[PDB]
């Protein structure tokens, strides 16, 4: 088997339970929620429409219009991190890309 597997830790998974409880309260269907309820969270966090698009762009790598529990966790993280007073680089590093959506060349 592979022992020396280069698998970078997804820093979003550290506070995922929290975004999970927020994900399940927006009515998840088969592991995804509608962008309407995500939109709702986003606008509750008082982020400008420009920043809203920023977050979506960074959260949904494949752009399937729906947010998986993984994707919403990432989005939610960016959101609350903005509320923390942090800013976003607006670029997606490999340790932010979901394991099942990432490539490394």
């Amino acid at each position: 088997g592979p022992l020396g597997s280069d698998d970078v830790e997804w820093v979003v998974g550290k506070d995922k339970p929290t975004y999970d409880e927020i994900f399940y309260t927006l009515s998840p269907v088969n592991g995804k929620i509608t962008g309407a309820n995500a939109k709702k969270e986003m606008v509750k966090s008082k982020l400008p429409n420009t920043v809203l698009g920023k977050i979506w762009k960074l959260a949904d790598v494949d752009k399937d219009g729906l947010l998986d529990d993984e994707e919403f966790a990432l989005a939610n993280h960016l959101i609350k991190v903005k509320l923390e007073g942090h800013e976003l680089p607006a670029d997606l590093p490999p340790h932010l890309v979901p394991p099942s959506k990432r490539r490394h060349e």
């Binding site: 962008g35 809203l52 698009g53 979506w56 762009k57 949904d60 752009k63």
Partner: peptide, 12 residues
């Protein structure tokens, strides 16, 4: 009718 472009935010 609700319709988006590249997300529910980036609608024109």
């Amino acid at each position: 009718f609700n319709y988006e472009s590249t997300g529910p935010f980036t609608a024109k």
